[model samples]
Target chain A: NAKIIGYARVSFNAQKDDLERQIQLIKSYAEENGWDIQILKDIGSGLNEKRKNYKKLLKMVMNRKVEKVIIAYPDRLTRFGFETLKEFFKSYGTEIVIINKKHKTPQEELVEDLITIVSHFAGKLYGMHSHKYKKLTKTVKEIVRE
Target chain B: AKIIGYARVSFNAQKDDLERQIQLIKSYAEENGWDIQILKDIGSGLNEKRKNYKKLLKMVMNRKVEKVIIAYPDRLTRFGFETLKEFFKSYGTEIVIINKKHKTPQEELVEDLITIVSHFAGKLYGMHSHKYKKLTKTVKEIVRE
Candidate 1:
């Protein structure tokens, strides 16, 4: 069968419901388009370069093993430098399909990505069980209140 | 907890820039009614061994400061400003980034991307290698858009 990949990524296990929804939507979209989709799901921050499936997806693209990749949004692929990655994929004759192409201003998107960056760092420094993460978030909220 | 102003220059050549940055930070702190003590460092943006950088982070960790004023994100750390900002906030310290300009957010991302490539290009391929030079040159042209 031809390779058409559906990539769904969520930042945390707490977002499993949203991840399931993403997977279902990707499947449904593929069904509608008659695509035998191979779904790659990642539970990690979009900014995480070490995502296993994302690296696998990229390897497939580089090796010309994948013809098309479908994602709900650009951020699902990576937090920043979407255009550069898209251009790189295109160079390898792989096409990227964004399911719902509605966009946010880069300013707004940058804000979200910035939060992701902070949380990723917090998780790394304090670990998933650390209350220190809560303290960091509390600090942002308190300061922003002023 | 007190207000702190931090400034850094990566090299002796940019000592003047560091002085100017401190002056800009000092003026802003005064305008904001802050009695700020400026901490200065001479080191690369990514140099983690910089003493003042460690001092600043220690201040945050110890809750010794209520606010930190920096000239720009890169000066605090070459990258991961949001991470550092959140870390400071978690400590009940507010970070005020004083650099402002008329530009879109995409431009900011592009500059960050360039920083990453420029930093790693030398690391992955020896800084003196033809590959490193070629890669940085190409990356500059890529971000030129």
Candidate 2:
């Protein structure tokens, strides 16, 4: 069941219009590459407040219905965890493309994810886990800068 | 140890919407005379993480919270109610859900809000899953070291 597909997504309010912009861009981009593909769009995180399309998309890809997947931007697929997803797709023998690539390393991208989570960086460091990473000055600096 | 009330509502939900829930939660706590702070966040419990929720999570993790209250357990979180209860267990914190059977409007509001929380869980769970997996793995690695 080899097929090509495109997905568009927006996480926050300021970027709502970008949702349709991304879908059209992905579809047009597919046209430029001379591929006939279906475009899937998810908006507002939806009523269940979950990205149900994402789960559906993952199921379709893993079921081998998807030959390749495309997004207008890397984050259209997810705000973070792109690397984990990138590898998961590869494991299923699929490839992913981004319309516009952001120049960010995995470590740099992870900084954004960690920023939301590590609300207690200083407290964590001074706590039990601190001893293991005394040599983590560079890593800690990345979080601080972000 | 402190007693706290967690009042939830949608981000755009009107101010008067949660008055009764808050009043009920506060009244019950007051009857028993526990010092309280009512924490409110205006987004579905399951969508994006709430700031107040995160603050509460941090306090629970730090063992600074004694008990957390809601008109119902679902008021506090949509899904993972048990995981939260288990987390609180470690700190000896109690997850307090007010009134066994809610009155009509009270019942309808929680039914609405809890679904909102439920809606976000699968999505948020997907978002957090990989990271937590990584974090769990790292901790085990650290434990081995």
Candidate 3:
């Protein structure tokens, strides 16, 4: 029997009820799909990429303990960077399913890819501008000191 | 009654002024029948990753102190007001900001502004890092396996 695993994560800063909602969503999705759901909970910020429970989930996948994973959404699991995501996809072996989007078409993937590219470009631009601002401020301070 | 007091001073503060603040905080604790445990350091209030602050949090977590006292609200953090509130709520310990009176409009305004600015900066950093992509991919990988 192929077992299905569910991953649920809520930020430590988020309401407890929000975490509960993620768990409930995963459970329901698992039951509806006839998948064996194994939920992982971590008491850490979503911003912390090195979450213990998240690591455990990966190990379980690597060990062949799970066949499918269902998540309420992507944002619940990570908020790091695109390179990190690409790395995870390349390394992980299980079939990934996002319960929220229910995306099935090639067009959906295309749109997602485009949005990701544009957002990343915008982020890079903002980062460069911020760095320039910091550098200019430093220069001004140095000039004043001299 | 086993009462222990805690005192903190921010960086860029004069040593004399900090000594005075500590004395004041100690006096307050003594008046209320408490022993003082002063943890002094040179760190800014704006820095959330302060060494002494982390140590103090651990102390509270370990239930080592009967009471925790500070010279001022800003001594704890100049960052998120909500974070401060939540921190206090979690530890199940009382925090007394000796310099400021409770529930004053001016104090409330200051706290509100601090919370807004802290959250705004946090959101900006999140967006700047492209954290969402990393998160989505990690989640997808976790579930896929």
lDDT: which is higher, 1 or 3?
Answer: 1
Candidate 1: residue A35 lDDT (0-100):
71
Best by TM-score: 1
lDDT of 3 by residue, B68-118 (tens): 677766566543333344334444557777877532223223333333323
Against the true structure, candidate 2 reaches a TM-score of 0.38
DockQ of predicted candidate 3: 0.01
lDDT of 2 by residue, B1-145 (tens): 7888888766454456567678988898989988898888776555336788777766775677899888866567644455347546655689888865653233333333333223232233333465434433333333233
Model 2, residue B74: C-alpha shift (Å): 1.4
> Which pairs of residues collide in model 1?
none
Can you write out model 1's per-residue Cα lDDT over A1-146, one digit (the tens) per residue? 24899999877687788789889988999999887888999987776766899878877776778889999878788765465467556655788999877633233233344445445444544566478667654443332223
DockQ of 2: 0.02
TM-score of chain A of each: 0.74, 0.64, 0.59
Candidate 3 lDDT over A1-146, as tens digits, reads 34577777654444567678879988887788676666888756544556788767655654556667677766555533322232333334457778885422222222333233323332332344465334433332332223
The CA lDDT at B127 in model 1 is 73
Candidate closest to the true structure, highest DockQ = 1
Between prediction 1 and prediction 2, the one with superior TM-score is: 1
As for model 2, its CA RMSD to the true structure in angstroms is 18.0
C-alpha displacement of B14 in model 2, angstroms? 3.9
Choose the strongest candidate by lDDT. 1
Ranking by TM-score: 1, 3, 2
